[PDB]
Amino acid sequence: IETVPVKLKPGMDGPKVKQWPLTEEKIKALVEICTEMEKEGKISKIGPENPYNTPVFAIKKKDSTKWRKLVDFRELNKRTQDFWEVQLGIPHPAGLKKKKSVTVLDVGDAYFSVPLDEDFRKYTAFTIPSINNETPGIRYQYNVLPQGWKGSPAIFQSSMTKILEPFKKQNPDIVIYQYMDDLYVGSDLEIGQHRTKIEELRQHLLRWGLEPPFLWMGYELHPDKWTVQPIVLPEKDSWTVNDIQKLVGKLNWASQIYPGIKVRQLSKLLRGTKALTEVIPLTEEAELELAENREILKEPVHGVYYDPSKDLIAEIQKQGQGQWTYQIYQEPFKNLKTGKYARMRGAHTNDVKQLTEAVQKITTESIVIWGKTPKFKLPIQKETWETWWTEYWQATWIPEWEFVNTPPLVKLWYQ
């Protein structure tokens, strides 16, 4: 009820980001939403003395039919001061990624009960555009903590920990983690028990609240079952020339990750100009080298460590037939997580929808494990991505991304 003083970083003005084009249905939905928010005092109309802007659009949360307003606060978040005044930070709970079930709740509506510092409100300006720019865009700013702003969970952190205090000590084995508008609550019990303690949680914010439009939904994870991928080599009875070339190529690549990998006995097998489909018998020396490489690849990569002061980088490869591989790392060849998706749902004919869902699930895994979002290297042309990703987005955060325009040779090795 009284405002925390907030400021931008030194020598840094507010965001001035262009509003991107919105469809008729989106603009309409936002006009209806913002009219309600203005009546509730959450936002106010602003004048032309406010030159700042942050893009807004509208989405559908997973498994619902009601529009949710989503503000792209990525630039404001970069420019906003870092929040270490009461706490250097919330030391990320390493136990969250070890629970059997983690449910994600959209608690962002609770943020609207705390006023935003009157001097900082101007930096939250946004515009509802009109079709064909036929009428002036409707300009608002926030009067309360906005959803999607990195300062909202920080300013609300003191109020949230008191809200949850009765639930915490009645259920001491439960991990509860807050990232932006999401609450992650992990448990090891039966899913039926799990779902019931989730709804017990919901009551605590129901009670304190007196209505939250998206508090009742739950996206359930199982980080205990999360799969990884070690490097594996084929097991064959007959090797063609082409088979051995692909093996040597894959081992050459793997030797950047594992020092002890050797390929010289195997490369000697290719000595000769034989047809690509001709079977080559392995020499004893080549089979021993192959066996020793297999053993090396069963071991973890040497010198892999997470540094919270460095960015996480996520790379994605399209493997065809709806399957996608990805790696998360900070230094090249020191992967912190790798994986593969194929279950991308409601998109067997839409490459970009599949990629958008992959980005969202990789970001979710990143938040659970390290408490921050990776920067993505996307195998897509910038113009294709920017035209369509907002049509399939259903998370309340947005990571940063860049675009890969040269085809990687490494795609063959992660397949």
Binding another protein by CB under 8 A: which of 53, 124, 152, 330? 53
Give residues with Cβ within 8 angstroms of 72, minimum separation 6: 17, 54, 55, 56, 57, 148, 398
Distance of CA 35 to CAs 25, 39, 41, 71, 122, Å?
16, 6, 10, 16, 19
Judged by CB under 8 A, the stretch of 2-10, 63-71, 125-133, 177-185 that binds another protein is 125-133
Residue 11 sits in the site that holds another protein (CB under 8 A): no
**Stretch near another protein under the rule CB under 8 A, chosen from 45-53, 99-107, 173-181, 183-191:** 45-53
Complex with another protein: residue 65 or 132, whichever CB lies closer = 132
Rule CB under 8 A: say whether 264 interacts with another protein: yes
- Applying CB under 8 A, among 4, 27, 175, 369 the residue interacting with another protein is 27
Q: Cβ–Cβ contacts within 10 Å for residue 399, how many?
A: 19
Q: Quick one: 138 or 144, whose CB is closer to another protein?
A: 138
Question: Which residues partner with 57 through β-bridges?
Answer: 70
**CA gap 274, 14 in Å, rounded:** 66
First and final C-alpha spacing in the chain: 54
Q: Is 10 in the site for another protein (CB under 8 A)?
A: no
Q: Are 389 and 414 in contact (CB under 8 A)?
A: no
Nearest Cα to 186, choosing from 226, 150, 243?
226
Q: Which residues contact 49 (CB under 8 A, 6 or more apart)?
A: none
The piece of 44-52, 113-121, 160-168, 365-373 that touches another protein (CB under 8 A) is 44-52
Distances (CA, A) of 21 to 131, 350, 352: 8, 22, 19
Among 35, 170, 387, 415, binds another protein (CB under 8 A): 387
227 binds another protein (CB under 8 A): no
Mask for 297-326, x = binds another protein (CB under 8 A):
---------------------x-x------
Amino acid at 150: K
> Annotated binding residues, as ranges?
106, 181-182
Residues that bind another protein (CB under 8 A): 21-24, 27, 47-51, 53, 125, 129, 131-137, 139, 240-242, 245, 248-249, 252, 263-264, 267-268, 270-278, 318, 320, 350-355, 378-381, 383-384, 387-388, 404, 406-409, 411
> Annotated binding residues for Mg(2+), as ranges?
106, 181-182
